[PDB]
Symmetry: none
Subunit: 182 residues, 3 copies
Amino acid sequence: KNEPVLDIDGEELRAGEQYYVVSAIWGPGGGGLALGRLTDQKCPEIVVQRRSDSDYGTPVIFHNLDTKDDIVRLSTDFNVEFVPIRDRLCLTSTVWKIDDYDTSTGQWWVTTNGVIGNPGPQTLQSWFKIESGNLGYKFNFCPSVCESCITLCSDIGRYGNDGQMRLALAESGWPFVFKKAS
Amino acid sequence: KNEPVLDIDGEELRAGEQYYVVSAIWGPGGGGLALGRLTDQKCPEIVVQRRSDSDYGTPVIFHNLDTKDDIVRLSTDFNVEFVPIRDRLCLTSTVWKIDDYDTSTGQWWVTTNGVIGNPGPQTLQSWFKIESGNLGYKFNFCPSVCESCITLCSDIGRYGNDGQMRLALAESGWPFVFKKA
Amino acid sequence: KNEPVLDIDGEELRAGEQYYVVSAIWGPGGGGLALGRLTDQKCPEIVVQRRSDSDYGTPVIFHNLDTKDDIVRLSTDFNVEFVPIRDRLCLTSTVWKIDDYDTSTGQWWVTTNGVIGNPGPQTLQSWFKIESGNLGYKFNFCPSVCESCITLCSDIGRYGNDGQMRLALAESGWPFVFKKA
């Protein structure tokens, strides 16, 4: 019964529909998110952002906890799934999942090879939330799918990693907006 | 009088029972089968494979030809239905059917909006077999409900399309196993 | 200049790197390869497979033909050496080598006590190739290090042997994948 997420058109987000995730801050805040690849890892891909603010990157589909509700709502666990237009360099999934700890960088990366559905301990790292706290719109990884589980619980922001703007768990979240692909 | 189809626990598949159909090839081979959709088509949904080795996708149920036989057995026509709860179905069934020839890709696709029961020409595109082949079980479309009919016949393999892994008719079938739900 | 062999991570296999070699078929396909010992023979250790698909086994390292090309490539001869992080139970090597003909089983076993390097007649039994079919990858024994020599040329598969999953020459090769250690 939560408040709907809204795209730039004022329209409430629909699960299954494709949306560009674009920086709410343009200029040096960059453009949209898309799939990139690391130098020491060709697969699975990683969530990156384009330097150009005219680039909206790769759209995503949101998969609900209970898909009986087709409205994407705030502070609710869901799966974010990149839906690329290019051919797949990788045979692993393009679903967002929280990586394990990166001892070389000190940040929890947001990466691919996540899971659609199966809420519970097996998929704890595949569930994300959208909020609007002190930002335009932010991603928060704090899955409530498993009440006996212990999970990380914090905002999701951007950090520089080897020439790419990557997404990592951060205290100071980063603001986004949603755009119907059409 | 054929031999039954077994699941991961060694227990034969039951018609009416729920089973995850998971690729016997892990890693790059992806995992279980589930339901997806195309950019230009919202319904009926399409049969896809989740790419992660830790998600089994969507469970299925088997309907035998004879509704009285409870055992799922090899080299015999059956109905396969997904059993999801997504309310994004535009009332189309969850039963596997063979699509008509896709002129764009040159492949015969596997889809939904098939029919349970009613063996005959009407449900021709909805009847599937499981063959052992060489690896774990492979799916095969070769309906035997209409002797008078001209149907395609070949194994079922996997092929890429629109950023999703899909099921099509081919000679080299793709292997799968079954995990009880 | 052949295409590089790729591990699970999408990475071309590098000569010298520890890799786990694990069945590309999970479930009853078992797991990884390791050093085992037979009932009547303690040395040399043989190549075996752990029944649990969770046991990646013993890491190994590749040894190319030309000691300077670091890219492990397809259809190219190489030595293979087990890397037991366990204490070495024997004085013979961990290098893969085709055992002599087993009159009791009609199987050309894969054992150890092979030799790294010295291509030609002296080490013909330690030179293996990697290829791919419909599965991830399949081993093949068809060394080219001696043109005037006659050797068997066939794929490599798995067989039971006193309750241990050994490896031997076959016409259909078993599928594997490589995970960085």
